[PDB]
Amino acid sequence: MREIVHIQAGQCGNQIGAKFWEVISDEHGIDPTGSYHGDSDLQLERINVYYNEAAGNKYVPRAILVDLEPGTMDSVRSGPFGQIFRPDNFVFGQSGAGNNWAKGHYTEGAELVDSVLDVVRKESESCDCLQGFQLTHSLGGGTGSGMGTLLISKIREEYPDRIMNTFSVVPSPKVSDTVVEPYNATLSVHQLVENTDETYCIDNEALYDICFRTLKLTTPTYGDLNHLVSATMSGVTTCLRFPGQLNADLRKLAVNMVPFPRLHFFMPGFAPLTSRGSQQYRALTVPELTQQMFDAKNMMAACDPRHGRYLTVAAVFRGRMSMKEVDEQMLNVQNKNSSYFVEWIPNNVKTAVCDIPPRGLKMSATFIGNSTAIQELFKRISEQFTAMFRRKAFLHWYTGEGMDEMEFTEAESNMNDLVSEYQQYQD
Amino acid sequence: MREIVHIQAGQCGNQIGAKFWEVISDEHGIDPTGSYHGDSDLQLERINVYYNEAAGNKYVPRAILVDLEPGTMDSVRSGPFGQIFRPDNFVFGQSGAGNNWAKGHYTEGAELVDSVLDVVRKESESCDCLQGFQLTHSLGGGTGSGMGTLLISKIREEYPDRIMNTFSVVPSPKVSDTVVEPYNATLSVHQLVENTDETYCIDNEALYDICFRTLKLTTPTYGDLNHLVSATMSGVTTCLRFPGQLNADLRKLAVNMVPFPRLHFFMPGFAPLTSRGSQQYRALTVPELTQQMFDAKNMMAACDPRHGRYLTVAAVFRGRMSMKEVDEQMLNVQNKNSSYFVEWIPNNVKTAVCDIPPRGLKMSATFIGNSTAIQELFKRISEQFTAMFRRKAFLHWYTGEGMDEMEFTEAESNMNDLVSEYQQYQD
Amino acid sequence: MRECISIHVGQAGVQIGNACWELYCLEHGIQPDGQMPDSFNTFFSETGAGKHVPRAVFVDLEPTVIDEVRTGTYRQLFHPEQLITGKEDAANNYARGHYTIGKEIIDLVLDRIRKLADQCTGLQGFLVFHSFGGGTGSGFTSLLMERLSVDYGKKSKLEFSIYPAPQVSTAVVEPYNSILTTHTTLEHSDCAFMVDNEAIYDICRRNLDIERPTYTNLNRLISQIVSSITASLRFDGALNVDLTEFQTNLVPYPRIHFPLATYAPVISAEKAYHEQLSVAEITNACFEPANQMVKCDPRHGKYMACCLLYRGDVVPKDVNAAIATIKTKRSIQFVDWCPTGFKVGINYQPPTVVPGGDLAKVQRAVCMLSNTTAIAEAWARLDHKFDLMYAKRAFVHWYVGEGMEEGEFSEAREDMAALEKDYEEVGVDS
Amino acid sequence: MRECISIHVGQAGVQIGNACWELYCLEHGIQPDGQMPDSFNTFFSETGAGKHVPRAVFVDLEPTVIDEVRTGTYRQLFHPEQLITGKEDAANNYARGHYTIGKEIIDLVLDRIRKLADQCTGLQGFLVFHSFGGGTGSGFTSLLMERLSVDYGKKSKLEFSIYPAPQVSTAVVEPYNSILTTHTTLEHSDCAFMVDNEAIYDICRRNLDIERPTYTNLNRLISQIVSSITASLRFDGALNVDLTEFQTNLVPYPRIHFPLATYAPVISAEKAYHEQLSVAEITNACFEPANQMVKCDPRHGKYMACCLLYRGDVVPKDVNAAIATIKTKRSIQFVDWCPTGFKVGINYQPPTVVPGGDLAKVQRAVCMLSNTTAIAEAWARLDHKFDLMYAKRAFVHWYVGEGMEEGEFSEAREDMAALEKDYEEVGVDS
Numbered sequence A, B: 001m002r003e004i005v006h007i008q009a010g011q012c013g014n015q016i017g018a019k020f021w022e023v024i025s026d027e028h029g030i031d032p033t034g035s036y037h038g039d040s041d042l043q044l045e046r047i048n049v050y051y052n053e054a055a056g057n058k059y060v061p062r063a064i065l066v067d068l069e070p071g072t073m074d075s076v077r078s079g080p081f082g083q084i085f086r087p088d089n090f091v092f093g094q095s096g097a098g099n100n101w102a103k104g105h106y107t108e109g110a111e112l113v114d115s116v117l118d119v120v121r122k123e124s125e126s127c128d129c130l131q132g133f134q135l136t137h138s139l140g141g142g143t144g145s146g147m148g149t150l151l152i153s154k155i156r157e158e159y160p161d162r163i164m165n166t167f168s169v170v171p172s173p174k175v176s177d178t179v180v181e182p183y184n185a186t187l188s189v190h191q192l193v194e195n196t197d198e199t200y201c202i203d204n205e206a207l208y209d210i211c212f213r214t215l216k217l218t219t220p221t222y223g224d225l226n227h228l229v230s231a232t233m234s235g236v237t238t239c240l241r242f243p244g245q246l247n248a249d250l251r252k253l254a255v256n257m258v259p260f261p262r263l264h265f266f267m268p269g270f271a272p273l274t275s276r277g278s279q280q281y282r283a284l285t286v287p288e289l290t291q292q293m294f295d296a297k298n299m300m301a302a303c304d305p306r307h308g309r310y311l312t313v314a315a316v317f318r319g320r321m322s323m324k325e326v327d328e329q330m331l332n333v334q335n336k337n338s339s340y341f342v343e344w345i346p347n348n349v350k351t352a353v354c355d356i357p358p359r360g361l362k363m364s365a366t367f368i369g370n371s372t373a374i375q376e377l378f379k380r381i382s383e384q385f386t387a388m389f390r391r392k393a394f395l396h397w398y399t400g401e402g403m404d405e406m407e408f409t410e411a412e413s414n415m416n417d418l419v420s421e422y423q424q425y426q427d
Numbered sequence C, D: 001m002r003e004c005i006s007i008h009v010g011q012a013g014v015q016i017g018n019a020c021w022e023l024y025c026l027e028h029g030i031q032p033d034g035q036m037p038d039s040f041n042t043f044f045s046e047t048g049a050g051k052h053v054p055r056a057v058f059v060d061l062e063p064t065v066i067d068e069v070r071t072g073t074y075r076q077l078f079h080p081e082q083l084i085t086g087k088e089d090a091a092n093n094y095a096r097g098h099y100t101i102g103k104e105i106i107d108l109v110l111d112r113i114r115k116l117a118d119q120c121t122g123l124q125g126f127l128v129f130h131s132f133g134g135g136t137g138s139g140f141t142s143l144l145m146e147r148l149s150v151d152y153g154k155k156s157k158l159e160f161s162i163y164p165a166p167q168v169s170t171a172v173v174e175p176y177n178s179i180l181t182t183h184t185t186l187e188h189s190d191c192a193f194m195v196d197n198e199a200i201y202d203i204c205r206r207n208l209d210i211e212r213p214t215y216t217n218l219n220r221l222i223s224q225i226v227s228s229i230t231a232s233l234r235f236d237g238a239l240n241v242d243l244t245e246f247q248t249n250l251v252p253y254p255r256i257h258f259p260l261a262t263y264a265p266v267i268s269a270e271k272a273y274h275e276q277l278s279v280a281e282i283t284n285a286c287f288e289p290a291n292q293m294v295k296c297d298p299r300h301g302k303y304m305a306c307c308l309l310y311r312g313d314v315v316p317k318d319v320n321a322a323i324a325t326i327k328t329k330r331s332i333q334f335v336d337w338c339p340t341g342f343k344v345g346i347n348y349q350p351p352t353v354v355p356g357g358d359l360a361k362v363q364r365a366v367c368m369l370s371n372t373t374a375i376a377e378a379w380a381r382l383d384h385k386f387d388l389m390y391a392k393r394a395f396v397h398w399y400v401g402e403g404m405e406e407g408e409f410s411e412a413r414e415d416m417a418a419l420e421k422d423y424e425e426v427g428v429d430s
C-alpha cells in the first residue's frame, strides 16, 4: 500500500542506506533479525511501505543493494541490522567503477544494470500499489553517480508515472575527496535534471558544519553524517508511515515544491539538533523547531539561503503539536522575511504534521526547501568542470571507454541552463 | 512581559554579571542547577523578566556572556551558579583586546561582534515584549569598554525604541589599575553619551570606601564590590520583578530622571549597609535608610554630592513600608537641603516602593541620583587624557590598530561639551 | 422520515465527520458501538435489533485517515461499505481528484449513496464536508456533486467548506484548487456554508482562551455548528426550520448561496460562570466581527438574509426584542431590497457538551447564518493569489500533466470574476 | 435599573477600586467569591444563579496590580475580560498613556464598557477612578473620557482623582501630566472630585492617630467617600440624592465642577467612646479646614454650593439646626448669588466598617462635597510649578518623542490660566 522500493548505489549510498534501514527498523520496532518486537500497533499497518512479509512473522526490507565492489555489501551484511536484507537483492560485479562515470555508465555498469533491473522488477511487481522509488548515491564516484544515473533512467522508461526520489551527496569545494569530482558531478546532474522528480542535495561540508557548530560533536565519523541523512530520509516519509493531522506523501511534496519541472533540487534539513550538554538548557516547542529549521547553519547544503530566494519550503512536522502554532510560525516566517521568498508565489510554505515523533524526541521537524541558492552550488561544479575541461584534463580516461567530448559539452550546457533558469526565477 | 536581556562585557563585567545572576537567582529561588525551589508564588509570577522557561520545569538566564579571553569564560562557568547559563550564549574570541579600545572596537571586537549580535537577536526574538537591554562593562580595558560600546551602538541601531542600561565601572585617579585608563574611558564615554538611555557611574574608590568605613570589612576582595553592584542592579528592577504599593519600571525612572537626553549619568547607592558588630546597635526604620541613602559616604561614584546640585533623585524602596512617613522623609530631605537640589525642578526626588524585600533584610532602599557633581568625575578623566594627549603618549597602539588622532580629539570635545552642559545646568 | 445523508470527503471532511458523529452519538444517546442503553431517524438508521448505523459515507483517496476510524473508538458504529479508501492521494491536485483518481472511486461512492438513500423514505438532502485547498476536497467533491446533481436533482445539497485563510495557509497550490472547485460548486450546490481556519483559531484564542488549539477543537466547533443546523430535524421547538425553507429564506439569487456561519456563546468553563448568557447578548455577539467563522469584516459589507437558529431555553419574545435592537444599530447594515431579513428558529434541545471539550455547558446557543457581501473581498484576494501564481504558469504543469487544459483555469478565473461582479451589482443600492 | 459603572485606571485607580469593591461586598453581604448566602443591583449584575459580578472595569498598561487582583482573594469576583491589561507601562508619561500606548487598548476597554452598559437598563453614569500624577491615569483617563463623551453623551460622568499635594508628591514630571489631564477634564467631565494624599495623611495622623499609614488606609478612606456618594442610590433614605440631582445642585457653571469632599466622623475606636457624636458636631467638623481631604484653606476661599450626604440615625430637623448654625458662623462664608447653598441627603443605613480597618463604628456619618474657590489656590501653585519647570523645557522631549507637540503644552497652560481666571471672576462680589 503506497510501497517504496529502495535502491542504494555506491559505497556512500550503501552506507547511508544501511543507516537509513537502521533508523527505520528502530521506528517500526524491527529487531536485528527482522522480526517485530514493537509495542505500539501503529508500527504495523504501514509496514509494507518499506518491508515485505516473510514466512514466520518476519519482515525483509524492500531494498536493492547495488555496487560494483563486493566489499561494500560484505561490510553492509557484516554490520548491524545487516542480515535483515534479502540475500539475492545484493547485486555486485568484480571490478569497480574506479571513480569513472564512464565505466560506471557504459562498460561495467551496463552488464550489472540488467540484473539490478530484474531485481527491482521483481520487487515492484511483488508490491501491491507502488508509488515510487528511492535511490541513495553520491556524485563523486563512478558507481554511485554514473550507475545510479543509469538506473534512474532505466526506471524512468519502465515506471514513468511513479515518483523518482533520490538522496544525492554532491561534492563540495572544501570537502573534496576525489580529483574527478567535477566530471562525475556534472555528468550525473545532466541526467538528474530530467530523470528525477525530487533531488535532495546532500553534501559532506554542511554535514560536518552541523556536527561542529550545532551538535558540538568532537570527532564526527561518517556514521553521524549518515545518521543525519537517515533522519531526513525518515522525515520525508513519516506521513506515509504514520497517521497525522495533515498527511503529505511524496507526490504531495513534489506537487507543492516543483512549480516548474526542472527545479526539483531541494535543500534538506532537520530539527531539533542539539548538543549533549546544551539540550538540557533548550526549551522544546514549535517556535524553536521553526527557528532552528530555518537557520542557515542548520541546512544540509553548502549554499547560504540568504544569498537567494525560497521558491517553496516544506515543514514535515512530527509529534503531538498544535496546528495553530505551526501554521502561525510559518506565517511569521513568511511575513518578516518577505525579501527571502518569491513574490509571485503566495504561501511559499507547505506544512504537514504527523503525530508519531522519532524515538527519543517528542517532536521533530524536517526542513525541505526549494531555494535559488542551488545556483551557486551548481556554479562551483560548473567552474571546476570548465577549468578541468579547457585543458582536456583527465578526458583520456572517460574517452577511453566510449564517451566523447560532445557529451561533456552537453552536460555543461545543461548545468549552465539550469543555473540560468534558477537565476531567472530568483529575479 | 517587560523582560530584560543581560549582557556582560570584559572580565569585570562578567564577574559583576555572574554575581548579579547569583543574587537574583537567590532572590527568585533558583538553585545552582536551574530548578525552582522557592516558597512564594511571587518568585515565579515575574520569572520571565530575566529567565527563559527551559524544558523540565527549570530556568536559564536571558544573559549573553561576552569576552575576548576564554579564561574569564571558564572562570564564570566553573564557579557557583555558573552552570545555569546557556552554553551557546558564551561568546568569546582567542586574542583579547590587550587594553586597546581600538582592538576592542575596530578590528578584533568588530570581527567577533557578529556572533554577539546574532545571539542577542535570537534572545530578543524568543522573548515576548522586550523593554530594553542592560550591559555590564568596564571603561579601563579594551574588551569591556570598546567592545561593549560597539555592542551598545549596534543594539541602539537595531532597537532604537528600547532602553539601554549600563552598570559601568569608571576609572578613578587613585586606584588606577592600568596606564591607559583615561584613553579607554574617554573613547567609551563618547558613544555612551548618545547610545545609552541611562548610565550608572560606578568606580572602585567609592566601593572600597564603603567596604572600609560602612561595612568595616578588613580585607574586602572583588567579591564584596561585585555583591554591592549586584544588589543595586537587583534593586533597580525589583519593581519590575515584584509587585508594590507604587511601581516604577526602568522607563519610568528614565523619564523622571533625564530632563535632557545627555544627562543620564547617575550615582547608584544601596541602603541599609551595616557592619556585623554594629548590626544590633542600629534601628530598623525608614528615616535612617533615608539618611544612609542621602549622605555622601554611601555614594558609589567618587563624587561628593555636596560639591554639586541634585537634578533628580530616585529611591526604590523595598519591603512592607508606610507611604506617609516615606513622603515626609523625602520632603524633609528636600527642605533642609534646598541649596543642594536644583531650583527649577520642584519635587526633585521620585519615590518607588516595592513590597518584597531582599533576602535576609525586611527593608531596603536603592539610591539613584542624577547630580551635577558627576562633572568632576569627567574633569579628572579629561585632564588625565589631555596630559597624555599633548605628548602623543601611548597613541601609537591605537593609531597602528586603525584609529586616528582626530577621533581622540572629537571624543575629548564631546566630553568637554558634556561637562560644560552639566556646569551650566548646575548654576 | 426527514433523513439526511452526510458525505465526508478528504481528510478535513473525514475528521469533521468524526467530530460530528461523536457529537450526534452524545446527543441521541447512541453508544460508540451502536447500541442505545424516535428523533434519531434523521441521521441514524436502526438496523436489526438494538443497532443504529449512521446515514453517513466516508470517502478519501488515501487509506490512513479512514483507517484510524476503522480501528478507533467508533469502529463498530460504521461498517466498511460507507468507509471508502482509494489507493493514492490526490496530492493537493484538483486534477488528480477529479479525473485520474476520482473516476475509479466515483461509482462506488455513488452506489453506496444510492443504497443509503433508497433505504430512507423522507430524504431532505445531503451534507458534504470538505476543504477547498485539498486536492480530494476540491476535485472529488466537484465530481461527486456533478453526479449528485445529475442523479437526484431537485434534492437539496447542503455544503460545508473549510475556506483557505488570507494568511494561514498550508498548501502552495491552494488557490488553484479553490478557484477550480467553485466553478462547479456554483451550479451544483444549493447552499454553501463557509468556515475559515484562521477565524476559528482566532476565536479559540480569544473566546475559548486556548493558547494551542489543534484541528480537533476546530472540528468540534464545526460539528457544533452542523448540529445546530440539523437540530430542527432531529428535535422539536417553537419554530422549526427545514432545509427547504432554510434555502428559501437564505438564498436570494441562485448564484448567491454562500452564507457565513457563526456560533454563540463560545466560552470556556470559567468564563461561563460570570456571564449573563441572555438571548439579546448572544444575538449581539453573533453580529460582531470578531466571532465570524470566516476572516472577513462584515462592517464594510451589507447583509442580505440572516437565519437565526436559537436552541435551548429561548422564548420568541426576547428573540423579537433582540432582532429589534439589531435593526436599530447603524453599524449593521442590510440591503434595501430586503425589508425583513431574519428567518428565526427556536429549538428546545440545549446544545450538549462533548466530554473533554473546551466548550462550556450553556442554557442557550445561537447559530446565525448570514448571506452577506463580506465574502466578496475574500474571493477577491483569492483571485489575486490565483492570478499572481497564474501570470507565471506556476504549478500548472502538474494539473495539465494528467488531462486538464489551460481553458479550465481561464474559465474558472472568468467565472470568479463574473461572480465578484455579481456581488458588486447586487450589493449596490437602488 | 438605576445602575452605574465603575472605571479604574492606573495603579491608584485600581487600588482604590479594590478598596471600594471590598467595601461594597461587605455592605451588600456578597462574599469575595460572588455568592450571597434587591438593592445590590446598582453595582452588581446577577449572573445565572447565586453569582454577582460587579459593574466595574480595571485598566492598566502594566500587569502588576491587575495580576495581583487576578490572584488575590477577589479573583472569583471579576471575570477575566473585565480586567484589561497592557504590556508596557505609560511610565509617568501623558504622551505614552494618550497616544502611543493607549491607542491599542482603548478599543477593547470601550467594547467591554459597551457590553457592560447594554446589560443594564437604567445606567445613571460612570465612575472613573484615576490619578493626575500617573502617565496612565492622566493620558488614558483623558482618552477614555473623551471617547465616553463622544459615545454616550448625556450620560453623567463622575471621576475621582488623586490631585498632587503642594509638598507631598512622588513624581518629578508630575505637573506636566496634571496640567494636561485637566486640559481635557475641563470639558469631558461632569463632576471631578478632588483628593490630596497629604490631606489623607494629615487626617490619619491627627484623627485616627496612625503613626505609619500607607496606601491601604488612603484607599479605605476614599472607598468610604464613594460609598457615601452612592448610598443614596443603593438604599432608601428620608432625602434621596441622585447623580443628576447631585450635578444640578453642586455645579453652578459648566467649567466649575471640582468640589472638595470631606468625611466625618473619622475617628479611632478608643476615641469614639468619649465622643457623643451628634449630627450638629459632625456637620461642624465637616467645615473644619483641618478635615478637608484636599490640602487647601477654605478660610481664604468662598463657598458656592455644598452637598450634605448623611447616613445613619439622622432625622432632618437636627440637620436643619446644624445648617442654621453653620449659616450663622462668619468664618464660613458663601457667595451672594447663592442664597441657599445646601443640598441635603439623609440615608437610614449606617456606614459599615471593614474588618481590619482603622475607622470605628459610628451611628451617623456625613460626606460633604462643597464646590468652593479654595481649589483656585491649588490650581495656582500647580500652575506655578508647571511654569517653573517648563521655562527650561525640562522633560519636554520625553513627551515630544511620543506623538506630541509643545503647542498643546502651551494651550493646556493657557486653558488652566483661563480656569483660574474663571474661578476668580465667579468668586467676586456683585
Ligand SMILES: Nc1nc2c(ncn2[C@@H]2O[C@H](COP(=O)(O)CP(=O)(O)OP(=O)(O)O)[C@@H](O)[C@H]2O)c(=O)[nH]1
Binding pocket: A009, A010, A011, A012, A013, A015, A016, A068, A096, A097, A098, A099, A100, A138, A139, A140, A141, A142, A143, A144, A145, A169, A176, A177, A178, A204, A207, A222, A223, A225, A226
Ligand atoms: N556522507 C557520507 N559521505 C560518504 C560516505 N562514504 C563515503 N562518502 C563520500 O562519498 C564521496 C564519494 O563517494 P564514494 O566514495 O561512495 C564513491 P562510489 O563508491 O559511489 O563510486 P566508486 O568508488 O568510484 O566505485 C566521497 O566524498 C566520500 O567521502 C558516508 O558514509 N557518508
Ligand SMILES: Nc1nc2c(ncn2[C@@H]2O[C@H](COP(=O)(O)CP(=O)(O)OP(=O)(O)O)[C@@H](O)[C@H]2O)c(=O)[nH]1
Binding pocket: B009, B010, B011, B012, B013, B015, B016, B068, B096, B097, B098, B099, B100, B138, B139, B140, B141, B142, B143, B144, B145, B169, B176, B177, B178, B204, B207, B222, B223, B225, B226
Ligand atoms: N568592581 C570590580 N572591578 C573589577 C573587577 N575585576 C576587575 N575590575 C576592575 O576593572 C578594571 C579593569 O576591568 P577588566 O579587567 O574587566 C578589563 P576588560 O577585561 O574589560 O578589558 P581587557 O583587559 O583589555 O580585555 C580595573 O580597575 C579592575 O580592577 C571586579 O570583579 N569588580
Ligand SMILES: Nc1nc2c(ncn2[C@@H]2O[C@H](COP(=O)(O)OP(=O)(O)OP(=O)(O)O)[C@@H](O)[C@H]2O)c(=O)[nH]1
Binding pocket: A245, A246, A247, C009, C010, C011, C012, C013, C015, C016, C060, C061, C089, C090, C091, C092, C093, C097, C130, C131, C132, C133, C134, C135, C136, C137, C138, C162, C169, C170, C171, C197, C215, C216, C218, C219
Ligand atoms: N478545520 C479543519 N481543517 C482541516 C482539517 N484537516 C485538513 N484541513 C484543511 O484541509 C486543507 C487541505 O485539505 P486536506 O483535508 O488536508 O486534504 P484532502 O481534503 O484529503 O485532499 P488531499 O490534498 O488530496 O489530501 C488544509 O488547508 C486544511 O486547512 C481539520 O481537521 N480541521
Ligand SMILES: Nc1nc2c(ncn2[C@@H]2O[C@H](COP(=O)(O)OP(=O)(O)OP(=O)(O)O)[C@@H](O)[C@H]2O)c(=O)[nH]1
Binding pocket: B245, B246, B247, D009, D010, D011, D012, D013, D015, D016, D089, D090, D091, D092, D093, D097, D131, D132, D133, D134, D135, D136, D137, D138, D162, D169, D170, D171, D197, D215, D216, D218, D219
Ligand atoms: N491615594 C492614593 N494614591 C495613589 C495610590 N497609588 C498611587 N497613587 C498616586 O498615583 C500617582 C501616580 O500614578 P499611579 O497610579 O501610581 O500610576 P499610573 O496611574 O498607572 O500611571 P503610570 O505612572 O504611567 O504607571 C502617585 O503620585 C500617587 O500619589 C493609592 O493607593 N492611594
Ligand SMILES: [Mg+2]
Binding pocket: A010, A011, A069, A096, A097, A141, A142, A143, A144
Ligand atoms: Mg565505489
Ligand SMILES: [Mg+2]
Binding pocket: B010, B011, B141, B142, B143, B144
Ligand atoms: Mg580584559
Ligand SMILES: [Mg+2]
Binding pocket: A247, C010, C011, C062, C089, C134, C136
Ligand atoms: Mg489528504
Ligand SMILES: [Mg+2]
Binding pocket: B247, D010, D011, D062, D089, D134, D136
Ligand atoms: Mg502605573
